[PDB]
């Protein structure tokens, strides 16, 4: 657990849709009218 060359890494080297779909199917499985 030692950052040794981690600075040299930082020196040289500087979705939402299906979530709301999975939210929407969660809403369809609450009301059976849907």
């Amino acid at each position: 657990s030692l950052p040794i060359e981690d600075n040299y890494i930082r020196e040289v080297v500087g979705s939402k849709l299906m979530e709301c779909v999975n939210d929407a199917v969660q809403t369809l499985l609450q009301g059976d009218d849907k």
Binding site: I4, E5, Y8, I9
Partner: protein, 235 residues
């Protein structure tokens, strides 16, 4: 041919008069490619003071004294240019600006980091770039390996201890330990790489006996079943 360093070599050897670089068109103009207008504050300017003060005694064998004295006029001019420019700066200050501290905080921090060549955050494969990493690592090791071994500290807290002529205060090696942890960890880097190679390739080479959602997947549980199918015996 390092004309500004051969004068330093002649000064450090205390014999800048016995040779005095032998200033002609073949020697004083070959190492220059007019003197090249040195860069330091006084480390290369006090050299030209002693070089002129030594060459005041021959005064005619060395034709480059006119080239040195011309830059003596340029040094006295640009100091006089700045001394009028510093005076015109100190009058051109607005009497109210009220310089913001948290930007000067971001100006004191970012200037201090950019002085000693480290990466500054803004808040405002590929072996080509692999050599450019290891060329900065080896840059650091060769800079740590030029510090003297007798390095000591002095905190502002030792005056409460009342150190005598020979008391051996315990804050003397608070810079010497930190300079050897740094120098030796920059050599054991391929040592922790081999352990991390043996760590990652031992916890991830199974990947389906400890991870629950992978061993409870349909394709893995069927495949681990499928490799354990014993052979059917004929008759």
């Amino acid at each position: 041919l390092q004309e500004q360093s051969e004068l330093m070599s002649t000064v450090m050897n205390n014999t800048p008069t016995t040779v005095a670089a032998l200033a002609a068109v073949a020697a004083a103009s070959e190492t220059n490619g007019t003197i090249p207008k040195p860069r330091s504050s006084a480390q290369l300017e006090q050299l030209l003071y002693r070089y002129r003060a030594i060459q005041n005694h021959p005064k005619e064998n060395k034709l480059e004294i006119k080239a040195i004295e011309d830059t003596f006029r340029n040094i006295s001019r640009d100091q006089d240019i700045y001394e009028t420019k510093l005076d015109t700066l100190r009058k051109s200050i607005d009497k109210g600006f009220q310089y913001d501290e948290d930007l000067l905080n971001k100006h004191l921090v970012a200037l201090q980091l950019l002085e000693k060549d480290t990466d500054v955050p803004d808040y405002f494969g590929d072996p080509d770039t692999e050599i450019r990493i290891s060329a900065r690592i080896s840059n650091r090791i060769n800079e740590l390996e030029r510090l003297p071994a007798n390095l000591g500290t002095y905190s502002l807290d030792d005056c409460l201890e009342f150190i005598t002529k020979d008391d051996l205060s315990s804050r003397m090696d608070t810079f010497k330990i930190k300079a050897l942890v740094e120098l030796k960890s920059l050599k054991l880097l391929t040592k922790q790489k081999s352990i991390r190679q043996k760590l990652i390739n031992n916890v991830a080479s199974q990947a389906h006996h400890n991870i629950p959602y992978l061993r409870d997947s349909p394709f893995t549980a069927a495949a681990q079943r499928s490799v354990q199918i014993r052979s059917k015996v004929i008759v």
